[PDB]
Short mmCIF file of C-alpha atoms and ligand atoms in Angstrom, two decimals:
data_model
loop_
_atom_site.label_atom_id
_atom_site.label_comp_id
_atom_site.label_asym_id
_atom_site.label_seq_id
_atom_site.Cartn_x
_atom_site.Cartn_y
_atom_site.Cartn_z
CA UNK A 1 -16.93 60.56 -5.54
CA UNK A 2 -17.40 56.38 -5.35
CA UNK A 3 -20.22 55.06 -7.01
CA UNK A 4 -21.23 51.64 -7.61
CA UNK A 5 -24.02 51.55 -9.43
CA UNK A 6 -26.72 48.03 -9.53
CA UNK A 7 -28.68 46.90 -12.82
CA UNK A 8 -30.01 43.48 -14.03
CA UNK A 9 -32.96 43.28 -11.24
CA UNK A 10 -36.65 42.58 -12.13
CA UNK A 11 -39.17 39.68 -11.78
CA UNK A 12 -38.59 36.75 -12.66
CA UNK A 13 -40.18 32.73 -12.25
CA UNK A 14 -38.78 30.37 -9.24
CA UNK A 15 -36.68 27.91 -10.80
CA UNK A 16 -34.85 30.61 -13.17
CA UNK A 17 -32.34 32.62 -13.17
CA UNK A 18 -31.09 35.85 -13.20
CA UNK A 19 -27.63 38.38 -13.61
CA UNK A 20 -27.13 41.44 -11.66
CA UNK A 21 -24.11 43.64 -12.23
CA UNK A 22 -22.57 46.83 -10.87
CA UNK A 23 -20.42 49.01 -12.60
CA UNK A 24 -17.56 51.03 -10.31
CA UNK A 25 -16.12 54.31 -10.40
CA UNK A 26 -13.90 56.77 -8.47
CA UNK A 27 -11.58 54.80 -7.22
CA UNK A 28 -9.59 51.94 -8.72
CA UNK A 29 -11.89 49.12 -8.94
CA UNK A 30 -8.94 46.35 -8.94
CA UNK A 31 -7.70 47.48 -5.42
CA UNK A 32 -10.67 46.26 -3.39
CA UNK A 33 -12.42 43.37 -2.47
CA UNK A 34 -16.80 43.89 -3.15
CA UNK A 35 -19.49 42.14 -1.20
CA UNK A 36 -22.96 41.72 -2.13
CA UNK A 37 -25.70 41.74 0.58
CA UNK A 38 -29.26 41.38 0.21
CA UNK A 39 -32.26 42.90 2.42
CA UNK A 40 -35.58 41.27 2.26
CA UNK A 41 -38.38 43.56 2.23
CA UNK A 42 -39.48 44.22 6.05
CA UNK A 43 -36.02 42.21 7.28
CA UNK A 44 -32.57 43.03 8.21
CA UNK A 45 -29.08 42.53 6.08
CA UNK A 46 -27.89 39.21 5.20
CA UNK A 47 -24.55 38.84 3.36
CA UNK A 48 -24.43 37.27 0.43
CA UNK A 49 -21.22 36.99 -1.26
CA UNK A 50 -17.68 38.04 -1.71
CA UNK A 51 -15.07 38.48 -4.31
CA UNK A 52 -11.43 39.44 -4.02
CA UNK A 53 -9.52 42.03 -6.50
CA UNK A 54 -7.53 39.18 -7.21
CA UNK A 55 -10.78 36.86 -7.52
CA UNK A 56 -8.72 33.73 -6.19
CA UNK A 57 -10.41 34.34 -3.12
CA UNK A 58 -14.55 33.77 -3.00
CA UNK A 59 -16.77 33.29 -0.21
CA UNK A 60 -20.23 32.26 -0.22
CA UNK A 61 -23.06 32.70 2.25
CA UNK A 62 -23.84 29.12 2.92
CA UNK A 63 -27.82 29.83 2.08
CA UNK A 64 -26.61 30.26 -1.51
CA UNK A 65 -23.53 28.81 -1.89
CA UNK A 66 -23.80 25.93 -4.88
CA UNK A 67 -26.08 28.06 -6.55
CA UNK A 68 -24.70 31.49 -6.84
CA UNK A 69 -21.50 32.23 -9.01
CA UNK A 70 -19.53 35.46 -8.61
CA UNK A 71 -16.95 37.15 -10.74
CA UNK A 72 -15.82 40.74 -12.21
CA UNK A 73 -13.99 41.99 -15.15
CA UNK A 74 -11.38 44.48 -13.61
CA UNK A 75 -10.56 45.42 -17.38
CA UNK A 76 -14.32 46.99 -17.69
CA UNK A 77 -14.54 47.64 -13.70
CA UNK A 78 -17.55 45.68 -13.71
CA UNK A 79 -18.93 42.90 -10.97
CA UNK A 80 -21.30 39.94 -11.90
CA UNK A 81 -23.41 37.51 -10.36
CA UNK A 82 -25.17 34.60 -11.63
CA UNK A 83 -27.90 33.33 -9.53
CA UNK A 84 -29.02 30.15 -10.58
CA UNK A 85 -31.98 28.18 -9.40
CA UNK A 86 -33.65 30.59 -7.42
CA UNK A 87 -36.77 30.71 -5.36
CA UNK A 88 -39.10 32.88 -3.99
CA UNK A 89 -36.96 32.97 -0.55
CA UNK A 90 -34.23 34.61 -2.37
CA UNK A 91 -36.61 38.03 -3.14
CA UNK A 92 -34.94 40.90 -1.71
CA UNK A 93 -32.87 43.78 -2.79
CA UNK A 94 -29.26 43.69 -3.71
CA UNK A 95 -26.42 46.11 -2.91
CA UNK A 96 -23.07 45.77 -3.98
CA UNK A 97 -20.81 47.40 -1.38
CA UNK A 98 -16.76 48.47 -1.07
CA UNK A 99 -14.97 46.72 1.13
CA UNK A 100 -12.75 49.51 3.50
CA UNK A 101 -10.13 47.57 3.89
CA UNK A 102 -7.69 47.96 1.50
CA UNK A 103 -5.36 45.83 3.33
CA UNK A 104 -6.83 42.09 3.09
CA UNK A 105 -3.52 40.61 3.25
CA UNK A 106 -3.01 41.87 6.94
CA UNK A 107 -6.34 40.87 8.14
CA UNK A 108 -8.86 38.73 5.43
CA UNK A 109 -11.33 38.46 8.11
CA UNK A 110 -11.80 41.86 8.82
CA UNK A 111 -14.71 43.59 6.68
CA UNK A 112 -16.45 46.68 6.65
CA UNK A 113 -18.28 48.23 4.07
CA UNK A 114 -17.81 51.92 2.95
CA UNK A 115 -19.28 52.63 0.21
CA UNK A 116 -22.63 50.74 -0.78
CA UNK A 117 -24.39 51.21 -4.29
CA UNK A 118 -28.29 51.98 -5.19
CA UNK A 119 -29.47 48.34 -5.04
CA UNK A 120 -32.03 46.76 -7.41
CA UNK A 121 -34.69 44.70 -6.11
CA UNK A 122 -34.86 41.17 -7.17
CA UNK A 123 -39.04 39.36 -7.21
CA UNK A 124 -39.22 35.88 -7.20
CA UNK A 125 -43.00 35.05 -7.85
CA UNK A 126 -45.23 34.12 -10.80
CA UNK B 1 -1.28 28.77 3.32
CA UNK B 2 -0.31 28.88 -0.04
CA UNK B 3 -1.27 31.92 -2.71
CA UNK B 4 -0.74 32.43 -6.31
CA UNK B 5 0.47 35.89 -6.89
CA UNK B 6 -1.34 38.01 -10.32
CA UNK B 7 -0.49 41.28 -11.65
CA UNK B 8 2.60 40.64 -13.20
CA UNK B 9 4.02 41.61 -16.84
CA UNK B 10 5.10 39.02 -19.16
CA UNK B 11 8.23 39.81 -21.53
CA UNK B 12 20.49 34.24 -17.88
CA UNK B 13 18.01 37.33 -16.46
CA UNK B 14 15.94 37.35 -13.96
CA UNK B 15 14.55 40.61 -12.46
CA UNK B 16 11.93 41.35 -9.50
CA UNK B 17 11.33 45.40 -10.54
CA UNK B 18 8.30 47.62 -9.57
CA UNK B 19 8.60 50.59 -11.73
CA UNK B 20 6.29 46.91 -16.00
CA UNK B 21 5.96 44.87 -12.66
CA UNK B 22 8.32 41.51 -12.32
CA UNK B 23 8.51 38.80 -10.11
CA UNK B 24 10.55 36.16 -11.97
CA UNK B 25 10.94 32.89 -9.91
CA UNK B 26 10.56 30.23 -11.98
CA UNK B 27 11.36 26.53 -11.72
CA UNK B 28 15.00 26.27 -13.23
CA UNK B 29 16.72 23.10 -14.62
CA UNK B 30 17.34 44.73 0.11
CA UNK B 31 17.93 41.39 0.34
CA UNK B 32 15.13 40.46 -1.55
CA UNK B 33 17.02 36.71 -2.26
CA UNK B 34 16.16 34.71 0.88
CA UNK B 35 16.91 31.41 -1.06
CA UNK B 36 16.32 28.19 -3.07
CA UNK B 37 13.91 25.10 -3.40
CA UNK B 38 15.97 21.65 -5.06
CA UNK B 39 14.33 18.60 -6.09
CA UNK B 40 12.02 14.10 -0.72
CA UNK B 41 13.17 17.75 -1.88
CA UNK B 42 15.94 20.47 -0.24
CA UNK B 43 15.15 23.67 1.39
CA UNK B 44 17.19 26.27 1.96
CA UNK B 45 15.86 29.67 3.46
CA UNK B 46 16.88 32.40 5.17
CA UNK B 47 14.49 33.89 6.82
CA UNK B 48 14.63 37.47 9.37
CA UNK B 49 16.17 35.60 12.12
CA UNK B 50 18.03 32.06 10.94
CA UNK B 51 18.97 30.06 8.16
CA UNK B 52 16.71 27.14 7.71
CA UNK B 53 18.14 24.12 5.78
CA UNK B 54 15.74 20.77 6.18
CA UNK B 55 15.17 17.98 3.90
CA UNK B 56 11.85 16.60 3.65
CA UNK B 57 8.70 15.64 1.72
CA UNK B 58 7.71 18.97 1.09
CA UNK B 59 4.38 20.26 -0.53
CA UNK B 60 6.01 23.43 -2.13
CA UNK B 61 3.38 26.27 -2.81
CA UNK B 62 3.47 26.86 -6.60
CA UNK B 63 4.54 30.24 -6.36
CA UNK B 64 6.34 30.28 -2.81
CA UNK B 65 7.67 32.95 -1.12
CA UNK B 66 8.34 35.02 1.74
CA UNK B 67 6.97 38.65 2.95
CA UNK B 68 8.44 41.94 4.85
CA UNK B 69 5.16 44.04 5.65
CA UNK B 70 6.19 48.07 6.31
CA UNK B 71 4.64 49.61 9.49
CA UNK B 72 4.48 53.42 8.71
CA UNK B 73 3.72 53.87 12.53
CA UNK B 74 7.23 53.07 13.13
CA UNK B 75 8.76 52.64 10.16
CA UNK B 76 9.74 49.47 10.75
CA UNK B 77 10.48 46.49 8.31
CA UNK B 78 9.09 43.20 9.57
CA UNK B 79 9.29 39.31 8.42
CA UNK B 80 5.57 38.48 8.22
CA UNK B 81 4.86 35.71 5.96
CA UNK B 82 5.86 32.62 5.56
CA UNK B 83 4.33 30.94 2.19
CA UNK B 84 6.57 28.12 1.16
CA UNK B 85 5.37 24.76 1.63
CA UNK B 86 1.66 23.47 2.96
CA UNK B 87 3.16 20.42 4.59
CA UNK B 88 6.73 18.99 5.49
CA UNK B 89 6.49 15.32 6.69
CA UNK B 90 17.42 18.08 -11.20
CA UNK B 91 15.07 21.35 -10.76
CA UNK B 92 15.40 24.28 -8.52
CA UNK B 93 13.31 27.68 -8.08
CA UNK B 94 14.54 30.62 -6.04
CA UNK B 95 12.23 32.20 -3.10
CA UNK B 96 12.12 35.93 -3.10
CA UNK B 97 10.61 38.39 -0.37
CA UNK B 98 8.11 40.68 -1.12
CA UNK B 99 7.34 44.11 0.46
CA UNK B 100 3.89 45.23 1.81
CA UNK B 101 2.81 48.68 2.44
CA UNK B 102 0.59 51.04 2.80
CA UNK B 103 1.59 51.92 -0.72
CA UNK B 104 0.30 48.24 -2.19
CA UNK B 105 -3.99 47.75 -1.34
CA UNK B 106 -5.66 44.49 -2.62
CA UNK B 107 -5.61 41.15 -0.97
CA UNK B 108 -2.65 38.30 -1.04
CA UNK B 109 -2.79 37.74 -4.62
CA UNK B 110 -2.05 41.08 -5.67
CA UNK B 111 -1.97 43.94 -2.70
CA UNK B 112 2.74 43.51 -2.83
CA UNK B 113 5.07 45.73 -4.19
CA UNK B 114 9.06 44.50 -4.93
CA UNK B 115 12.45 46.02 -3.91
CA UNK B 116 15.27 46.01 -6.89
CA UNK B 117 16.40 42.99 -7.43
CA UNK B 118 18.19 40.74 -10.07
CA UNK B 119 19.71 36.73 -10.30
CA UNK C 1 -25.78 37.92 16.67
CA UNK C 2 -29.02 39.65 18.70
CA UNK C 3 -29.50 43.27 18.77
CA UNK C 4 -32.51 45.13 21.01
CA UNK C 5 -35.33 45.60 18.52
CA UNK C 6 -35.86 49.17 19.28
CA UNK C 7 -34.38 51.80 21.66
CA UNK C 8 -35.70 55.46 22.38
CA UNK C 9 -34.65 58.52 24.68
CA UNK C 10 -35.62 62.42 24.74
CA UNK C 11 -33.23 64.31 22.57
CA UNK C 12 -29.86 65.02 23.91
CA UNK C 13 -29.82 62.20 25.75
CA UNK C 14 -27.06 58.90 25.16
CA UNK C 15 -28.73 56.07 23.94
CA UNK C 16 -26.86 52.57 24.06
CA UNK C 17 -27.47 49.82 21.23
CA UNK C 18 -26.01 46.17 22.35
CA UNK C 19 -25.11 43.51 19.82
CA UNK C 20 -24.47 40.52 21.88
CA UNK C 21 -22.67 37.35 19.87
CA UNK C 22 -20.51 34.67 21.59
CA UNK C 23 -16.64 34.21 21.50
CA UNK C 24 -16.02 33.14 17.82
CA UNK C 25 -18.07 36.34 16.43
CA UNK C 26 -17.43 39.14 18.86
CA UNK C 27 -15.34 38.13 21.98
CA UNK C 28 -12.29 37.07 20.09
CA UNK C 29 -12.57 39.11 16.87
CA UNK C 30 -12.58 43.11 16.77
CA UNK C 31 -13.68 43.50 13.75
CA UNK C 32 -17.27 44.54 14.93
CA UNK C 33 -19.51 47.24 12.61
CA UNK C 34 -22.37 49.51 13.17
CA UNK C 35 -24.30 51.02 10.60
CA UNK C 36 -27.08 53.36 9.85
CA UNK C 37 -29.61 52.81 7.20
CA UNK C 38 -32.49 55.69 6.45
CA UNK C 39 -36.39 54.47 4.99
CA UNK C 40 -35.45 53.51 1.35
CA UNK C 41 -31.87 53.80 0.98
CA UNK C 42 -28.64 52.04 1.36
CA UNK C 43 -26.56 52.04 4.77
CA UNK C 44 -24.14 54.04 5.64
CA UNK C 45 -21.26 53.12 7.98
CA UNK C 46 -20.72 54.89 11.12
CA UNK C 47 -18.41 52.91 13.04
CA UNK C 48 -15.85 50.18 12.37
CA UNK C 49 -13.32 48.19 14.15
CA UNK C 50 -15.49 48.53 17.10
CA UNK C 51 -14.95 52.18 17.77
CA UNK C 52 -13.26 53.60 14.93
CA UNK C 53 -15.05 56.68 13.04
CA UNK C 54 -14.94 56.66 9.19
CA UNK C 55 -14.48 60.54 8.12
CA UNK C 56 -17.81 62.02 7.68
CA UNK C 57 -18.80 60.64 10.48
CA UNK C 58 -19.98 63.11 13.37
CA UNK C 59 -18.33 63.23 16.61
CA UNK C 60 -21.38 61.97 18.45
CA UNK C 61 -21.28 58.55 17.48
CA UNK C 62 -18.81 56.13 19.44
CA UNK C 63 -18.71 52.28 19.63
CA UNK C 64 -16.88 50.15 22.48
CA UNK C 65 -16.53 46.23 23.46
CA UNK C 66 -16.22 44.42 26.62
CA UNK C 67 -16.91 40.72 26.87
CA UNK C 68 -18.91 39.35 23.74
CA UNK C 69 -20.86 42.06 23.74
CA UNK C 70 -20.30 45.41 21.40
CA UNK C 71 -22.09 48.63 21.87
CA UNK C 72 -23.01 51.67 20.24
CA UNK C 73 -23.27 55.06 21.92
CA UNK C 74 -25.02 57.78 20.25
CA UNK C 75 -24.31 61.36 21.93
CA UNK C 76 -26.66 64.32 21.64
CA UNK C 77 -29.39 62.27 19.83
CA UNK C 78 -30.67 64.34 17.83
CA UNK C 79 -34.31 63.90 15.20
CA UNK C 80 -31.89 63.09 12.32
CA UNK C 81 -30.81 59.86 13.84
CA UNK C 82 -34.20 57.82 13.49
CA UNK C 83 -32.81 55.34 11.58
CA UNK C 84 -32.21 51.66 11.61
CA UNK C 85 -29.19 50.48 13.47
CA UNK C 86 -27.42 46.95 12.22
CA UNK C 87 -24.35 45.46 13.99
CA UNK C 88 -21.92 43.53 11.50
CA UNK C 89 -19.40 41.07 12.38
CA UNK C 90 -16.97 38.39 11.45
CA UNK C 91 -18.05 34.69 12.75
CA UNK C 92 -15.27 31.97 12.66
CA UNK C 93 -17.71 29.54 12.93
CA UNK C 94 -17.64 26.22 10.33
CA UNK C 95 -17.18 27.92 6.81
CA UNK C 96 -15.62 32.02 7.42
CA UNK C 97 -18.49 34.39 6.63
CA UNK C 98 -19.87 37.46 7.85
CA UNK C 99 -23.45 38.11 9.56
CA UNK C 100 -25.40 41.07 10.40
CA UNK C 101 -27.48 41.74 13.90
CA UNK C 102 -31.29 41.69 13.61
CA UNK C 103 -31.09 45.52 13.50
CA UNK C 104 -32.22 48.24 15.98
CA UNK C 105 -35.16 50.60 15.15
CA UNK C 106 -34.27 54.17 16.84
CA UNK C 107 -36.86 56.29 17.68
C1 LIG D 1 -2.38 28.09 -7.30
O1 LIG D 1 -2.09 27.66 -8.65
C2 LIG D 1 -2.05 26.20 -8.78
C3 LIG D 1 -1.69 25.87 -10.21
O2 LIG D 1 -2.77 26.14 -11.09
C4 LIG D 1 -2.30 26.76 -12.36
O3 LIG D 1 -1.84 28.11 -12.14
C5 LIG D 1 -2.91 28.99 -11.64
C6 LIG D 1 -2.30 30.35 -11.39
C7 LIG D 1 -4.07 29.05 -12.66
O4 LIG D 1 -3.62 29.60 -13.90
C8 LIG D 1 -4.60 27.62 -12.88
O5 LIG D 1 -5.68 27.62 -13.83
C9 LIG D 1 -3.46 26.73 -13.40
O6 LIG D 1 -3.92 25.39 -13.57
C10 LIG D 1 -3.41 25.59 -8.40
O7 LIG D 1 -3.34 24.16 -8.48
C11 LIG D 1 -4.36 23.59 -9.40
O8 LIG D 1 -5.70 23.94 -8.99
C12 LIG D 1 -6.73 23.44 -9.89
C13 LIG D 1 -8.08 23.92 -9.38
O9 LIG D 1 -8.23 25.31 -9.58
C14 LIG D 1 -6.65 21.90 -9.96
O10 LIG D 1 -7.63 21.40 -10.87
C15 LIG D 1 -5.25 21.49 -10.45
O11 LIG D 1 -5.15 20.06 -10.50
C16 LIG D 1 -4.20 22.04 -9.46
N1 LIG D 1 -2.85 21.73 -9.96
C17 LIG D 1 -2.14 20.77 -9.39
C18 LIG D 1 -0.77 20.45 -9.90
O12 LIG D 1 -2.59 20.14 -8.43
C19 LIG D 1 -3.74 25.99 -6.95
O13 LIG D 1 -5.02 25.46 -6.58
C20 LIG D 1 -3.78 27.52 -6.88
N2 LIG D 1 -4.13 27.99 -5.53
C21 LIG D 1 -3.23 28.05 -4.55
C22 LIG D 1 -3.13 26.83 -3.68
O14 LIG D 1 -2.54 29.04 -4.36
C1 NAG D 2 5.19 48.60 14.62
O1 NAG D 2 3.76 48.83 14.63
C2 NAG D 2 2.98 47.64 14.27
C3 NAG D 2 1.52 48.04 14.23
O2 NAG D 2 1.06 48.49 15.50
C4 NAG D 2 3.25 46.51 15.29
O3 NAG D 2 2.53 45.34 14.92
C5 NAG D 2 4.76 46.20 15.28
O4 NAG D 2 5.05 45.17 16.24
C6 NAG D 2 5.54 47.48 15.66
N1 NAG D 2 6.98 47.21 15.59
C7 NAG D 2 7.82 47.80 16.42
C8 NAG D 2 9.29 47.51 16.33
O5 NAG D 2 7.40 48.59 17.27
#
């Protein structure tokens, strides 16, 4: 069975910051590429971010890009990501999701998302 | 479009083995060979169809190479990439081709395999 | 990318979600998504490549494409489908990234 599995959410101030992580298992975590995507509360998907096995190839939605940072440890099988200098527009939840193709050297461009985790719901508010 | 290529084992010889995973082509003072980079600089490669020899200002990649990607619909070996320079307007390193498949996931960096191969 | 906000139909009928985009997000690239998200959990995808059925995926659900518009066709509807419907793609546009529809309520 694949599992990816969120932690790190909570409340936090505007202006902070804050780590989420996922931890992977069932399936060998350096042979795909994970997304994040967030869902605010009431609203639709928006993607967020993306990181390659190889991590030499990241991608950024351009409503966080310059403040979020992305990376994983394939040694522990475990994803990161910093968000820096966030606001209250940036409360939703978080899922990290598996990327179903397996093949991103034969088409990069093409993403779908098989298996998604929990996700853990990130407040910005004071 | 350029990549660097990971996943490799660290340890005249030269091997490119997938049993420890190699890929040795460094810069030097199956037909996996396709062929060499001197230096304006020289290129000479053979690719699937011709052999290329130009001279030019070349902006070598700084881990070039070449690709074969295996179709298991037809089983079919095909010349698919092309990753040796990003422009063309004493040293040497030699280009080898690497094999795609089914059998190698990931993305550029990392989703290739390697038929025997020695220099 | 726009989707319909909601569609409905009796069950066993065939209900049709659009996901219109424009030529550098679904005309020229095939790499269109669909998929189904239940009240309080993650999604689940049901269709990718434009029609393409993941395993575990029933029978009834089949997607298509013609123009720059990408559907999804949802046979038998049956109670168990209520769910909201979002249509993924890849947009070529400026800076490569991916977007999601506004998502389809099915009732
Ligand atoms: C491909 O690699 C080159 C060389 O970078 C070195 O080798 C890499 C594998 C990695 O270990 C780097 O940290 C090493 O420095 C990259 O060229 C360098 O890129 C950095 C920015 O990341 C830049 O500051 C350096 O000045 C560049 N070096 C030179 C001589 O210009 C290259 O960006 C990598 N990506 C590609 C194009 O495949
Ligand atoms: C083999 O199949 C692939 C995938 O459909 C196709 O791109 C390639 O051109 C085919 N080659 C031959 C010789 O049929």
């Amino acid at each position: 069975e694949v599992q990816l599995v969120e932690s790190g959410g909570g409340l936090v101030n505007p202006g902070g910051s804050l780590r989420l992580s996922c931890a992977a298992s069932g399936f060998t975590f350096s042979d795909y590429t994970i997304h994040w995507v967030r869902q605010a509360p009431g609203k639709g998907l928006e993607w967020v971010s993306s990181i390659s096995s190889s991590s030499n190839y990241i991608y950024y939605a351009d409503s966080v890009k310059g403040r979020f940072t992305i990376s994983r440890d394939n040694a522990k099988n475990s994803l990161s990501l910093q968000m820096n200098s966030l606001r209250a527009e940036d409360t939703a939840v978080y899922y990290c999701a598996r990327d179903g193709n397996a093949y991103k050297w034969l088409l990069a461009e093409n993403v779908r998302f098989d298996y998604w985790g929990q996700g853990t719901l990130v407040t910005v508010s004071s | 479009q350029c990549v660097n290529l990971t996943t490799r084992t660290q340890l005249t010889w030269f091997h490119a083995i997938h049993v420890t995973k190699r890929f040795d082509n460094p810069v030097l003072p199956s037909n996996i060979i396709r062929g060499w980079i001197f230096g304006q600089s020289l290129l000479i490669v053979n690719n699937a169809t011709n052999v290329v020899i130009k001279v030019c200002e070349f902006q070598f990649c700084n881990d070039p190479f070449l690709g074969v990607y295996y179709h298991k619909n037809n089983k079919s070996w095909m010349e698919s990439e092309f990753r040796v320079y990003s422009s063309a307007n004493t040293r040497f390193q030699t280009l080898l081709a690497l094999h795609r498949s089914y059998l190698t996931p990931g993305d550029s960096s990392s989703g290739w395999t390697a038929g025997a191969a020695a220099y | 990318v726009t989707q319909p906000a909601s569609v409905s139909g009796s069950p066993g009928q065939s209900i049709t979600i659009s996901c219109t985009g424009t030529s550098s997000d679904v005309g020229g690239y095939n790499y269109v998504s669909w998929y189904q998200q239940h009240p309080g959990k993650a999604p689940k995808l049901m269709i990718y490549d434009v029609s393409d059925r993941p395993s575990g995926v029933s029978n009834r659900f089949s997607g298509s494409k013609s123009g720059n518009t990408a559907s999804l066709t949802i046979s038998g509807l049956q109670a168990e489908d209520e769910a909201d419907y979002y249509c993924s793609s890849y947009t070529s546009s400026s800076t490569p990234n991916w977007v999601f529809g506004g998502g389809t309520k099915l009732t």
